[PDB]
Amino acid sequence: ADDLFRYNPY
Amino acid sequence: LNDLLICCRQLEHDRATERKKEVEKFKRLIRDPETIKHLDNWDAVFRFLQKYIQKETECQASRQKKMQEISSLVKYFIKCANRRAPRLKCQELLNYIMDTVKDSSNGAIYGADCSNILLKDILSVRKYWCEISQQQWLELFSVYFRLYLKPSQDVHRVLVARIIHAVTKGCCSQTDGLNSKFLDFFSKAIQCARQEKSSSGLNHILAALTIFLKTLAVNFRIRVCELGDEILPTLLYIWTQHRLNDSLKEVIIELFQLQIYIHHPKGAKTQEKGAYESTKWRSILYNLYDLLVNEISHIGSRRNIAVKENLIELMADICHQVFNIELGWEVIKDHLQKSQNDFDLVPWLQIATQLISKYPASLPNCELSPLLMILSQLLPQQRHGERTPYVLRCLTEVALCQDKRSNLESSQKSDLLKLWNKIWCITFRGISSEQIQAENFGLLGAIIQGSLVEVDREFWKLFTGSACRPSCPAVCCLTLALTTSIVPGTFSLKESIMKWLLFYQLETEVPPILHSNFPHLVLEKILVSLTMKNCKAAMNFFQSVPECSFSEVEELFLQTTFDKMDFLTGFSVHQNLKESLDRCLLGLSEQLLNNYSSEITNSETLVRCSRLLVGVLGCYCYMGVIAEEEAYKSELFQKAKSLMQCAGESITLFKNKTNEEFRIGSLRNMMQLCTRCLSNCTKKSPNKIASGFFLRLLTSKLMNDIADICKSLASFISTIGAINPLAEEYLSKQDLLFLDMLKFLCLCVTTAQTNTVSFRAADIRRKLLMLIDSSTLEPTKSLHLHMYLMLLKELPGEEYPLPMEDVLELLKPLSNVCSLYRRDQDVCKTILNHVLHVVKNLGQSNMDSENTRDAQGQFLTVIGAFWHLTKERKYIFSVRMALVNCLKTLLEADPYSKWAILNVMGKDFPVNEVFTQFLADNHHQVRMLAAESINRLFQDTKLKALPLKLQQTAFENAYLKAQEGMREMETLDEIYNRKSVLLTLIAVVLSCSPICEKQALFALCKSVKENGLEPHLVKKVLEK
C-alpha cells in the first residue's frame, strides 16, 4: 500500500 | 478496560429509567487511563452509541428537547474522542450524518444540529477532508442540495447553503470534480431566486457555482457558455429587483467577470480571433452594459468618490467588447464634458483610464486630439480638488498610449505637440504640492519618456535645492529625463543634483534615501552617470543591459483555437565630479556610523547605506572607470564593511536572547533587504558585481550567528473548509523570520562558491544540512515541511553542482515526507514542483561513483511510485501536471535515457516511452502541456538533433497515441479538444524537427480526411 515510496537497493 | 465493556453491554439493554443513569455514567466515566487505553476501541463504543441512538429514537416539545439533548450528547462524544487527534473512523460517521439528515422524521433543529456538527467537526479536519472518496462527495452534494430546494423556509437554510459551498470546494479540490449534469441543479436554484424575495443563501450558492464553473471551464467550454446564456438574464433581473446587498452583489459581479473571461479569452473581440459569439450573448452584453451604467450613478457603488476596482474592470471589459445606439468613445467624451459635480465625473475618468491601460488599440487615432482637449479643461483649476489625481492618471495613460503609435499624421502630431506643451505648462505649476506629488511626477515621466515636450532649464532647477525632497516618483522622473535629455551646464548643476540626492541635515534626521526603499540599482546608476563625461550615453548603456488565477485557462483556450503559439516564434569620467561624489558618500556614511547607537538607530538603514556604497562601486566596475582589485582597497569598501559590522550587533544580541518579540520586525526587514541585495544570475551586469561586493562584505561571525539562530528557532517548540498545512496562517512571526534567514543563508551558500569570501561555504552548507537530520526533522510539523521544501528548492544549483553526498542527504527524508502526505493533493503537487529542481544536479555523471547511482535510484523510485499511483486514478490533474513537468525535466537531463528509467512492479520503463502516454489523458490541460513539451523528444535541449531512428520511433509513438485518444469514441467539446491536441502535436513536430517535416506533413494530409480535421484550422497552422 505504502511500500512503493520507500527505496530498496536490494 | 473491562469496566467500559461491561457498561456498554449494560447500555445495550433497554431499561425504563436506569438507561438515564447509564448515560450519566458514560458521560462521567471518561478519564485519562480510559483515553490512553482507547488508543489504537473508539469504533466499538461509537457503534454501541449508534445502537443506543436507534433504540432511543425507536421509542412534540418533549420529543424536541429529547432530540436536542441527544444531539448534545453526540456532539460531546465527537469533540471528546477527536480532541487530541483525529482517530474516529470517518466513513461510518458520514453514513450516520447522511442517515440522520436525509429523513424528515427528525425535527428541523435536530437536522440543523447534525449539519452544524458535520460542518464544524468533519469538514474542518484536514485528514477527513482529504480521505473522503468521490462517491461520498457526490452523494453528500446531492443530499444536501435536494434539502435546499425544499419549500421549508427556516434559519438553517443559509447554513445548508454553506454546507454545499464547502462540499463543492472539496469536490473540486480533492477529486475529479462534479459531472456536468449537476449544472441543471444549480439552475433550478436560480429560478427559485427569481420568485423568492428573501434570498436567504444565494451568496454561498453562487460562490459554489463560481467554483464549479472555474473547475469545469477547462473542458466543456461550449457547455459553460450555453449555461451562462441560459442563466445570466435571471441574475440581471435579480440584481434589478433585489435589495442590492453587498456580498451578493460582489459574487454576481465576480460571476459576470468569469463569464466574460470564458467568452472572450484575453479580450478576443471577434470569433476568428478566439471569441465565442452568440445573439443571446450579445444581447446579454448590451443589457449588462446598461445595468452597469445605471449602477455607476449610485452612492453605494463608491468621504470617497472612487468606484470599486472590480466594477471598473468589468465596465472596461464590457466597453471594449461593445465599442466599435453608437456606444463609442463619444459617449465617454459626452459624459466627461456634461458632468459638473466631481461625484459624477470620477467614475468615467476611471473607466477611460482602465480602458486605455488594458486595451491601447481601443481608442482610435482621430479621438486623440479631442480627448486631450476635454481633459485639459478639467485640470487647470488653481486649487487641487479631489478629482485632480484621476485626471493626472488619465493623462498619463493617454500619453503612454500615444507613445506606442507610429501612424500619426503631421497635422495630428502638431496639434498633439501643442496640447501636450500646454498641459505641461499647467501641470508644472503646483508641483510643490506634495499631496499629489506621486501622480504629477509620473505624468511628467510619461511626457518625457515619449519625448512629447522639450525640457527647459527651469525643470532641472526643480530637483536642485530644497523645493522637493527625494522620492521614488521624483527619482524615476529624474532618470527618465537623464535617459532622453542632456544636462545643461548652467558642473554647477550636476553637483547640485548630486548634493540634493545625497543631502543630509548637518547634526539625527536620517536622509530620505536611507528611509524610503528604492528600486534596486537606481540611485547608484544616476549617481555614476552624473559623474561621467557623456551622462546620456552612460544612462542608455546602463538601461541597455539584457533582462535576467484564471489567466492560464485563457491561455489554454487561445492555444486550443490556435490563436497564440509560443513555439514557432569607451567611457570617461570627470575626475573632480568623481572625487566630489566619493567625498559626499564618505561623509554621509561617516555621519551615519559615528551617530550610531545600540538602540536608537534602525538596523536596515546601515544595510541600505552599505548597499548604496557597494552598488556605486559595482556600477563603476561595470565600466572601465575602476578596476576590480583596487576597488576593494577603496575607502568606500572599508566604510561599507564597518557599517555591516555595526549592523551585525543586532543579530548577535537577538542570538543572545531569542525570547524577545519586538525585535522580529526589524530583523525580518533586514533579512529581506539582504536577500534582495544578493543575486544568483551570471550575465555580466552591475547587479552581479554589486552582489559579489556585498557577499565579500559579510564576515564569518555573522554567518555563524545566523546559522545558530536558525538552528535554535527550528528546534524551538472565515475559511470554507480544512486549512492547507502549507498555509501561512499556521506560521508565527518567529517562523517567518526563520524562513527569511534560511533563504538568505541558502542564497549566500549558492553564490559564495563562485567567488572567494571570508566565511567558509562548506561549513555553512553542512550546518544547513544538519537541520534536516532524521533524528531532528518531523515532517508532520508545518515549519519543518516549509524548511525542507525551501532547502530542496534553493540548495541545488546548475552552474556549480553540489557534492553527491549532499544530494543524498537532501534526498534521504523525501521518501518519508511523501509517505506522510500521500493523501493530500495540494501538498503532493507542491512537493513535485519543489523536487523537480534536483534533476539539474542529479543529471551530472562525471563523478559516476556509487553515490551517483544511489541518489539516482532514490529519486527514480519516488518518481516511479508517483507514476504508478497516477496510473490507478489516484491523483487529480494538478498532481498529473506536476508529474508531467518533472518528467519533462528528466527528459531534458537525460535525452538518451541512459539512467532515467522508472522501476515499478519489477519492470523498467524508459522515461521517453512513458512521456508519450500522457497524450491520451482525460484532462485537456495535461494533454496540451504534454503536446507542447513533446519537442524534448526530438532535440538535445542542453540544439543538435537526435539520431534518425529515435526521432522516427518517437514520432510514430506520439502520433499513434494521439490517434488512439480520438479512436475511443452534445460532446463537441471533447472532439474539438482531441483534434486540437493532434494538430498541436503535428505543428510542434513540424516546427522543431527538420528531419520529420515530410512525415508530419503526410500525417497531416492523411488526418485531413481520415480524422476529419477542420481544413481552415490546419490551413492557418500551415500558413503560420
Query: DSSP strand E in B378-449: where?
Result: none
Instruction: Give the residue from B49, B45, B57 showing the smallest Cα distance to B5.
Output: B45
Contact of B853 with chain A, judged by CB distance below 8 Å, is answered with no
Contact of A10 with chain B, judged by CB distance below 8 Å, is answered with no
Is residue B940 within 8 Å of B900, Cβ to Cβ? no
Amino acid at B515: H
How far apart are the C-alpha atoms of B703 and B698, rounded to whole Å? 8
Instruction: List, in order, residues 6 or more apart from B372 with CB less than 8 Å away.
Output: B395, B398, B416, B419, B420, B423
Contact of A6 with chain B, judged by CB distance below 8 Å, is answered with yes
Contact of B832 with chain A, judged by CB distance below 8 Å, is answered with no
Interface subset of B 34-73, CB within 8 angstroms of A: none
**B937 secondary structure, DSSP code:** G
Per-residue HEC secondary structure of B840-879 comes to HHHCCCCCCCHHHHHHHHHHHHHHHHHHHHHHCCCCCHHH
Helices (H) and strands (E) in chain B, counts: 51, 2
Partner residue opposite A4 with nearest CB, options B854, B858, B868? B868
Q: Check CB contact under 8 Å for B865 and A4.
A: yes
How far apart are the C-alpha atoms of B906 and B897, rounded to whole Å? 18
Is residue B692 within 8 Å of B750, Cβ to Cβ? no
The grid cell for B705 is 550567528
Instruction: Give the residue from B401, B297, B284 showing the smallest Cα distance to B339.
Output: B297
Q: Check CB contact under 8 Å for B819 and A6.
A: yes
Q: Check CB contact under 8 Å for A5 and B904.
A: no
Partner residue opposite B819 with nearest CB, options A5, A8, A9? A5
How far apart are the C-alpha atoms of B643 and B596, rounded to whole Å? 10
Q: At what angle do helices B523-531 and B472-483 cross, to 10 degrees?
A: 40
Buried b (16+ CB within 10 A) or exposed e, B790-813: ebbbbbbbeeebbebebbebbbbb
Phi first, then psi: give them for residue B988, nearest 5 degrees: -65, -45
Please tell me the distance in Å from B511's CA to the nearest CA on chain A: 58
How far apart are the C-alpha atoms of B1016 and B1011, rounded to whole Å? 14
The grid cell for B898 is 541512459
Instruction: Give the residue from B608, B605, B606, B615 showing the smallest Cα distance to B581.
Output: B615
Amino acid at B290: D
> CA angle at residue B667 from B664 to B668, to 5 degrees?
80
Q: Identify the closest residue of chain A to B812 by CA–CA distance.
A: A7
The grid cell for B359 is 486595451
Q: Check CB contact under 8 Å for A6 and B868.
A: no
Phi first, then psi: give them for residue B910, nearest 5 degrees: -65, 150
Phi first, then psi: give them for residue B760, nearest 5 degrees: -105, 120
The grid cell for B260 is 466574460
Q: A interface mutation test: which of B852, B861, B870 has the most A CBs within 10 A?
A: B861
Helix, strand, coil share (%) of chain B residues, nearest 5 = 70, 0, 30
Give Cα B422 distance to the centre of its chain: 43
Q: How far is CA B271 from CA B267, B316, B970, B983, in A?
A: 11, 20, 21, 20
> CA angle at residue B362 from B356 to B364, to 5 degrees?
105
Beta bridge partners of B532: B573
Q: Is B431 helix (H, G, I), strand (E, B) or coil?
A: coil
Give Cα B960 distance to the centre of its chain: 37
Q: Identify the closest residue of chain A to B813 by CA–CA distance.
A: A6
Q: Check CB contact under 8 Å for B815 and A7.
A: yes
How far apart are the C-alpha atoms of B744 and B923, rounded to whole Å? 39
Partner residue opposite A7 with nearest CB, options B822, B857, B868? B857
Q: B interface mutation test: which of A2, A6, A7 has the most B CBs within 10 A?
A: A7
How far apart are the C-alpha atoms of B455 and B476, rounded to whole Å? 16
The grid cell for B799 is 552552474
Is residue B578 within 8 Å of B531, Cβ to Cβ? yes
Q: Check CB contact under 8 Å for B861 and A9.
A: no
How far apart are the C-alpha atoms of B903 and B865, rounded to whole Å? 8
Specify the pairing of strand B901-904 against strand B907-910. antiparallel
Contact of B815 with chain A, judged by CB distance below 8 Å, is answered with yes
How far apart are the C-alpha atoms of B35 and B80, rounded to whole Å? 10
Q: At what angle do helices B368-378 and B329-338 cross, to 10 degrees?
A: 20
Could you tell me the end-to-end alpha-carbon distance of chain B, in angstroms, rounded to an integer?
78
Q: Check CB contact under 8 Å for B822 and A5.
A: yes
The grid cell for B824 is 493530500
The grid cell for B946 is 537526435
How far apart are the C-alpha atoms of B610 and B315, rounded to whole Å? 48
Buried b (16+ CB within 10 A) or exposed e, B975-1003: ebbbbbbbbbbbbbbbbbbebbeebbeeb
Contact of B831 with chain A, judged by CB distance below 8 Å, is answered with no
Instruction: List, in order, residues 6 or more apart from B409 with CB less than 8 Å away.
Output: none
Q: Identify the closest residue of chain B to A6 by CA–CA distance.
A: B815
Instruction: List, in order, residues 6 or more apart from B256 with CB less than 8 Å away.
Output: B232, B235, B288, B314
Partner residue opposite A5 with nearest CB, options B854, B857, B865? B865
Q: Check CB contact under 8 Å for A8 and B861.
A: yes
Give Cα B297 distance to the centre of its chain: 34
The grid cell for B580 is 566630489
Query: DSSP strand E in B301-352: where?
Result: none
Judging by beta carbons within 10 Å of its beta carbon (0-12, 13-18, 19+), is residue A9 exposed, middle or buried? exposed
How far apart are the C-alpha atoms of B497 and B491, rounded to whole Å? 10
What's the residue count for chain A?
10
Contact of B358 with chain A, judged by CB distance below 8 Å, is answered with no
Partners of residue B822 in chain A, C-beta under 8 Å: 2, 5
Is residue B920 within 8 Å of B964, Cβ to Cβ? yes
Q: Identify the closest residue of chain A to B850 by CA–CA distance.
A: A9
Contact of A1 with chain B, judged by CB distance below 8 Å, is answered with no
How far apart are the C-alpha atoms of B317 and B359, rounded to whole Å? 9
Q: Check CB contact under 8 Å for A6 and B858.
A: no
Q: Identify the closest residue of chain A to B869 by CA–CA distance.
A: A4
Is residue B7 within 8 Å of B22, Cβ to Cβ? yes
Contact of B869 with chain A, judged by CB distance below 8 Å, is answered with yes
Amino acid at B450: G
Is residue B392 within 8 Å of B427, Cβ to Cβ? yes
Partners of residue A10 in chain B, C-beta under 8 Å: none
